[PDB]
Amino acid sequence: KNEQELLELDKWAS
């Protein structure tokens, strides 16, 4: 249900 928010989080994986 809250799957979209994880997508934006994956970008900050540096």
């Epitope: 249900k1 799957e3 979209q4 994880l6 997508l7 934006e8 994956d10 970008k11 900050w12 994986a13 540096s14």
Partner: antibody, heavy 122, light 110 residues
């Protein structure tokens, strides 16, 4: 009944703009993101961008920024794509799809719209 | 930049044959890869995601394997309804680079 419905085929002059729609049906539009994929006639698929159906910030590949504007409208159950300065290379079928997150870099499209064919000619 | 090298560009095999399609990544993106089927005059549909997981409704002939940069799609027995062009894709988040494979056109020998 879970499908994505897209706008119809369009004819536009070079230098003009086209705005195609994608409406979510059979499911909550704002539960999942929506991504866009392009396919030139006789060519393979080329990913364009995905847009957060809640916030509206798009995430596009290098070649699909600025000239291409992904937006969410007052309507809860539509996202939109706009091409400005339509060029001969933009002639293609533009697919709408629902974006899934199997994990980090495990992104996949489970539901695809029927596509909108855009032809660029005077 | 990154790009997916998909081979063979096309294949012709008889009914019930084993068909293998491979997709090599010029660099490591992730261990996860998705396969898509596009039938003539139709939109693409999801075959496999996560390199091995079948989407619901896809027959079990469709198999997915691989890790790192090398991935393969296996069709146990080439059914007549499997006529289509198949595409692979990996999806990198931080840079927005989701390259597609150039595509493999599957036709049948009868």
């Amino acid at each position: 009944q879970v499908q994505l419905v897209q706008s119809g085929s369009e004819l536009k002059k070079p230098g003009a703009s086209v705005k195609v729609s994608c409406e979510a049906s059979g499911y909550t539009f704002t539960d999942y993101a929506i991504t866009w994929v392009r396919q030139a006639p006789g060519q393979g698929l080329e990913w364009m961008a995905w847009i957060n159906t809640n916030t509206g910030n798009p995430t596009s590949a290098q070649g699909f920024t600025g000239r291409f504007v992904f937006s969410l409208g007052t309507s809860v159950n539509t996202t939109y794509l706009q091409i400005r300065s339509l060029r001969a290379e933009d002639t293609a079928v533009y697919y709408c799809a629902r974006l899934r997150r199997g994990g980090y870099n495990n992104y996949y499209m489970d539901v695809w719209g029927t596509g909108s064919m855009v032809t660029v000619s005077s | 930049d990154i790009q997916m090298t998909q081979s063979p560009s096309s294949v012709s095999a008889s009914v019930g044959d084993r068909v293998t399609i491979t997709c090599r990544a010029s660099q490591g993106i992730s261990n996860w890869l998705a396969w898509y089927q596009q039938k003539p005059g139709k939109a693409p549909s999801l075959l496999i995601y996560g390199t091995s997981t079948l989407h619901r409704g896809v027959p079990s002939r469709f198999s997915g394997s691989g890790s790192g940069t090398d991935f393969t799609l296996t069709i146990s027995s080439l059914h007549p309804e499997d006529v289509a062009t198949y595409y692979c894709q990996q999806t990198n988040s931080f840079p927005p680079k989701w390259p597609f494979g150039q595509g493999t056109k599957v036709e049948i020998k009868r």
